[PDB]
Design an enzyme around this catalytic site. Structure first.
Site, PDB file in Angstrom:
ATOM      1  N   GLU A   1       0.874  -1.155   0.000  1.00 34.87           N
ATOM      2  CA  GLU A   1       0.000   0.000   0.000  1.00 34.87           C
ATOM      3  C   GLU A   1       0.924   1.222   0.000  1.00 34.87           C
ATOM      4  O   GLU A   1       1.576   1.463  -1.007  1.00 34.87           O
ATOM      5  CB  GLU A   1      -0.991   0.005   1.174  1.00 34.87           C
ATOM      6  CG  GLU A   1      -2.096   1.081   1.045  1.00 34.87           C
ATOM      7  CD  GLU A   1      -3.106   1.084   2.216  1.00 34.87           C
ATOM      8  OE1 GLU A   1      -3.312   0.018   2.844  1.00 34.87           O
ATOM      9  OE2 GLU A   1      -3.695   2.158   2.506  1.00 34.87           O
TER      10      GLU A   1
ATOM     11  N   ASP B   1       0.659   4.852  -2.263  1.00 37.84           N
ATOM     12  CA  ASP B   1       1.305   6.152  -2.123  1.00 37.84           C
ATOM     13  C   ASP B   1       2.637   6.197  -1.376  1.00 37.84           C
ATOM     14  O   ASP B   1       2.974   5.290  -0.621  1.00 37.84           O
ATOM     15  CB  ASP B   1       0.327   7.112  -1.446  1.00 37.84           C
ATOM     16  CG  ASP B   1      -1.074   7.084  -2.071  1.00 37.84           C
ATOM     17  OD1 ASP B   1      -1.243   6.669  -3.237  1.00 37.84           O
ATOM     18  OD2 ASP B   1      -2.021   7.492  -1.380  1.00 37.84           O
TER      19      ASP B   1
ATOM     20  N   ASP C   1       1.003   8.922   2.957  1.00 37.91           N
ATOM     21  CA  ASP C   1      -0.428   9.130   3.036  1.00 37.91           C
ATOM     22  C   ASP C   1      -0.643   9.723   4.426  1.00 37.91           C
ATOM     23  O   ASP C   1      -0.848   9.001   5.404  1.00 37.91           O
ATOM     24  CB  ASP C   1      -1.155   7.788   2.860  1.00 37.91           C
ATOM     25  CG  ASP C   1      -2.677   7.907   3.014  1.00 37.91           C
ATOM     26  OD1 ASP C   1      -3.200   9.035   3.128  1.00 37.91           O
ATOM     27  OD2 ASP C   1      -3.349   6.855   3.029  1.00 37.91           O
TER      28      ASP C   1
END
Lengths: 543, 543, 543
Positions: A247, A280, A283
């Site tokens: 993630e 990302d 974040d």
């Protein structure tokens, strides 16, 4: 001798002398050496009796699930810990041998293999990231939940140094003043690699990730839930490196988790590098009505006073967004984002200042609408755009100054752009027969320049002659009308006149004249607005 | 009691109890304390039997040559090691008491002294650096080869912490996942201070220099041979300081060494400082046809896809080049180079991007042709030039944007220079009676401005009056021809006319007129190009 | 067994076995474990007999005053030390629950409480900082001097790691090559938290503060007296964080202390962060005639060749000055200062270069006359000003280039401001009906633009038409006189003429004509300066 020995030697017990970790923990006084691999069962809990221990690991903790350490005294240190799962799960590897990202669900499904590293276990976020993968993944590759996690629970002042592992995870639950220091590249599992979760009890404080590197993992490398470093900004991520997070590199949670807030305030995010995250780089948003946090009536959505200290961050290769955040009243500085598939920066900020930001070659796969987006009324001071490769910047309510780079002006949308304090200027032109200073009124046209000041070569190089021309757009044709000085080295000014009878309203100021053509007499006339404001038409030139 | 003692005490053997290091190594179980100075002979090899040991050094290893450590288990740590040669060689010290570099071979030869520090042993590279020194150096000062080296051979996961020494060297040969951490300022010998050499076996990976400081030495402080950090960039130099390297601060080797490639790929070079190197700050080139590497047919010379992660580097005082490299497809950012005798940056790069580069006061001794050189087609976004002190920048094929500094425009050579995205502009002039916006077409002249827009004071300060003038160069005389507005506060426009009969070709556009002088009638005429394109000559002004 | 045990176990003595610290110190051989709290009396001195010891602290040293460690051998390490006073003094806390600074003496006196942290003991500097507080403070809150200090005296090569405490202080007196590493947030007392004092003996060298964080304290967090890192810059502060210093984050002392100089030279100040100091972020000045230092005849006041290596510093929230220093021949780079109540930068420097400086929202409380002050002849290359919030910059003798930000031009005062090397330019206007390139001659007026080049929309958005106008100021009215091209899409040039009979001196150049009004005949005349320089008046236009 015993009396003497008891006083002159360093105390340390070693796991090899005990059947269980708890037995070793109970016998420990100062040091505890993990000298033999230890297979733990999920949920195995060790009580350290409030002792301040120095745990030196020279072997592995093997098991799927959590190994829970409790009641370690303040000042305890764990070094060299290595977590490894017993299960070898199915992992996907969304990149090629040339390090190109694979975005096609079928191409990604084809990478499936059983391994404890060099890939990650698919999760529901992958269903969003690679559309259609949900139906293509074989059932044995879906819903896996493998992580060998070291959970430190409700401890204060405990540090974990040089940790590593395969399908490894490190969780500080309900802890304060704890640090994850110099992580020796653990390869992550299903959960976050380093998580500071403080959903119960006081807000987490003094929790840091200092240095080290983290790789892979299905979700974010480092993550914080309900932590508040206070005005002193006691907590955060400093000097770390994240590679290929499933993630994001760093994630401060957003929204409600359970019956409380998972948001974070007053943390530092500095001197860090995030490379190749599937989502990302950073974040740092807080909002996705706020149980356990500020009410929406006090602070609107995306306008919480997060107050993070953010400086000197580098992001490269994100398949998602390089740098993202929300909040109000923030000061952000020295951010460098390069080669990202989605937006380099996605900023849902208001009344915030961004200083020295460099967004180089982002949104390369058109995942977003722009390279940098800012929603609220912010200030950008120093913005470098374009490397070597849809708006570039869309910050409708922001005021910007200091953009550098080969940006296409038609791809800029801001509230105000200005260079109020430049000194004497020189425009240097290379490779062209002219130099130019153009003016573009975006309200009139975002694609055409409305006027210009040019300098053009007369003859050729080394002629020592050029002509200057002042232009204006007419009929959507740039430079349609112009006044020239020294065209063809004639040393005179070429003046444009109204091609027909000039209407009274064409002249603007008093004590000015406007030449016009009177075709029926082959004469040049002049509409004159006398110093007193009265209009008179005179004959200017005749046969 | 023995049973009890065996279980409650920390295991450690100390060198003082053994005749040789191998004997101590063989008895070791957990810790090994170096508590007495140990004189080793060159080539002395110690076999650690695959044991994961913690070696704590509180004394010196004395000897010329290599002390070879083999078979240390993964996780082994060596802290506080201190290497010192038995020989005190002849060293040169090419700098003065005021810290000025000495460039004269005779002045350098005069600095000769026998010492283990504060200078370095001359090598063949000095013959190039100080021309003629080769024939001036006494024979006892030539060809010396003194280095007390700790060689870690073919080990994985071994870290050396807080190392120091005099005429010291640290060599990892055929190692992987090894680190040189927080070096406590070792003073170098003839060889590199920290070298990761992987010419045999697999390419080195996971090898780092983290923090610490290094001083002197005859060659480069940190050097890598045949290392590839992979896509994850697992390896490199982060947070280190190099002072007075006999060659360069950091060097990634170039060319063929033996029968294979010594080149390096995918490494990180970040947050580091290099001061006063005799040669370069960072020498990150790979080429000087490539056995063991990419063929010249695949990647031309200087165009290898090195892919290093380079960010936040500072270089000051190099007698050579501040920052040098070659390669294609690189992204480089946040480099600051100050006060260098040779080029601040020497870039043999192609299709690469350089963001936020500051080259301040370099090539101060005219060693090179420019302050910054870029050979290939690159992009520079943000370039600060000139501090307080031959082209400044010569990047013939590069496109640049955002130069700041008191640069002499005639010393700039690039393919294209542009500021495409500035907002509304204000040119502020201080200390002068006028403000100016000049235009210079380098194709016409690199030394003369071809036109300008000026604003000049009428009367004096506080007059509240100024005149604006638009100029053009003619006869190689800048501002030779001009149109003025408000000269002497007259509130009118002064217009230049052709001093003689205007030729038909002088007028450019339709619906324009060009005034000209007709001396024989004391009349002003006007060459008119009617809206239909036809030419007509009219009388404009008469007696 | 004893023989065997003596050879196989790690040596360490623990304080719990001894009545005094000296007894434990005398018995120590390798390790020394502080395993029980120890109350020391002020001035208690421990002699370590030149032994190289590893002191591991797992308990506190409690006492007001100094605990003096002497004769520790080179290589000694102290880890985890925790100092705590026996006295709980009265402390003030000059900030609110919203983290707003309190500047009112009465509001500050009201914060008084007895605590070992979250505030600091008032000192005489507070009498200056909060005017009138001296008479408002109750006598029991004045003149307190509580600090639990660990004093390392005249030692070489001793490092203190992960130190902490309450009302704690760490003092290296007469030491060299010592380091304060990874301080674990000690809360300061009356004296500096980490001080390197070398007033006697040789100048301090090799003394560093590496990493860590420090909070509170009545005076400066880190301070140096009479230290000189030499050309190699061996010493300084790198990677540290200071929060809420009672005085400054970092302070290099100035002037004479005792009978000698307390000044410092050749130190590094890099990669550090200072937040919320009551006084300054970094106070790197040396002068406030110089016993023990350079005579005023050699180097004038504020012009010492300090030669510090300063790079990558961030300061936020200072109630005083963000960054301050003096000296000559300095190179400073990459400084970011945000949200300071006094000047962001106060520079009493001469012949120095400042590269990439960002001063964002400083002097917010008008404590000083400007946001950035530079006294001497310096060079600034890259200066970012204004965030989201009296001159902005007052550097009378400096030359500047590259200012970015929404600065008010009237608040700029420099010797010279220029952008010599920009390329082809485009001024992009957003939210307005026109784009502009203005010129302002500060000698004429600092508040009014003397001329401009505008482009204005004709009609409305999407008309594809605009007019260009060149203006000049007259009668202190900006844009009073102007020439237009394409006003109302007429495609002609509107030319201003002298409203009355033009005087001979109004025309400037030969081969030019200046139109003027002759009201009595309703004629336009033309003062012509023939190519030969002679003046003639012609009739230009008539009825």
């Amino acid at each position: 001798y015993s009396i003497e020995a008891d006083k002159k030697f360093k105390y340390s017990v070693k796991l090899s002398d005990y059947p269980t970790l708890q037995d070793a923990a109970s016998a420990a006084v100062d040091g505890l050496l993990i000298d033999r691999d230890y297979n733990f069962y999920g949920g195995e809990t060790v009580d350290f009796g409030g002792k301040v221990l120095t745990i030196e690991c020279k072997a592995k903790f093997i098991g799927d699930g959590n190994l829970i350490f409790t009641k370690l005294g303040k000042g305890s240190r764990i070094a060299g810990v290595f977590m490894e799962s017993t299960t070898t799960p199915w992992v996907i590897k969304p990149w090629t041998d040339d390090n190109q990202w694979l975005t096609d669900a079928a191409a990604v499904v084809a990478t499936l293999k059983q391994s404890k590293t060099d890939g990650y276990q698919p999760t529901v976020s992958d269903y969003v990231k690679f559309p259609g993968i949900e139906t293509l993944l074989p059932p044995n590759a879906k819903g896996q939940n493998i992580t060998s996690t070291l959970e430190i629970r409700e401890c204060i002042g405990v540090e974990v140094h040089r940790a590593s592992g395969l399908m490894a995870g490190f969780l500080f639950r309900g802890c304060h003043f704890c640090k994850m220091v110099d992580a020796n590249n653990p390869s992550g599992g299903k959960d976050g690699i380093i998580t500071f979760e403080n959903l119960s009890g006081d807000w987490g404080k003094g929790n840091y990730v200092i240095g080290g590197r983290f790789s892979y993992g299905s979700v974010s490398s480092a993550q914080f839930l309900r932590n508040n470093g206070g005005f002193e900004r006691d907590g955060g991520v400093i000097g770390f490196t994240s590679y290929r997070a499933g993630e994001s590199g760093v994630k401060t949670w957003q929204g409600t988790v359970g019956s409380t807030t998972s948001r974070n305030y007053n943390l530092q995010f500095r001197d860090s590098v995030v490379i190749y995250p599937v989502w990302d780089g950073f974040d740092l948003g807080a909002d996705t009505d706020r149980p356990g946090d500020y009410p929406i009536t006090q602070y609107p959505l995306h306008q919480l006073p997060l107050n993070h200290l953010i400086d000197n961050l580098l992001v490269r290769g994100a398949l998602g967004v390089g740098f993202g955040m929300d909040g109000k009243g923030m000061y952000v500085s020295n951010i460098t984002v390069e080669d990202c598939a989605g937006s380099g920066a996605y900023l849902l900020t208001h009344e915030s200042v961004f200083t020295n930001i460099a967004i180089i070659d982002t949104n390369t796969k058109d995942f977003q609408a722009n390279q940098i987006y800012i929603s609220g009324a912010c200030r950008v001071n120093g913005l470098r755009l374009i490397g070597i490769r849809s708006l570039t910047i869309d910050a409708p309510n922001s005021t910007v100054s200091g953009i550098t780079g080969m940006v296409d002006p038609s791809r800029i949308n801001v509230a105000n752009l200005a260079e109020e304090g430049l000194g004497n200027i020189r425009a240097n032109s290379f490779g062209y027969d002219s130099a130019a200073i153009k003016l573009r009124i975006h309200k009139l046209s975002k694609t055409l320049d409305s006027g210009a000041l040019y300098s053009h070569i007369n003859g050729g190089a080394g002629s020592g002659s050029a002509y200057t021309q002042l232009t204006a757009i007419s009929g959507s044709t740039p430079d349609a009308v112009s006044l020239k000085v020294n065209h063809k080295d004639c040393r005179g000014a070429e003046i444009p006149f109204v091609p027909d009878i000039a209407s009274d309203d064409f002249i603007k100021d008093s004590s000015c004249f406007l030449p016009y053509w009177e075709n029926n007499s082959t004469s040049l006339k002049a509409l004159v607005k006398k110093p007193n404001g009265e209009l008179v038409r005179l004959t200017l030139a005749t046969l």
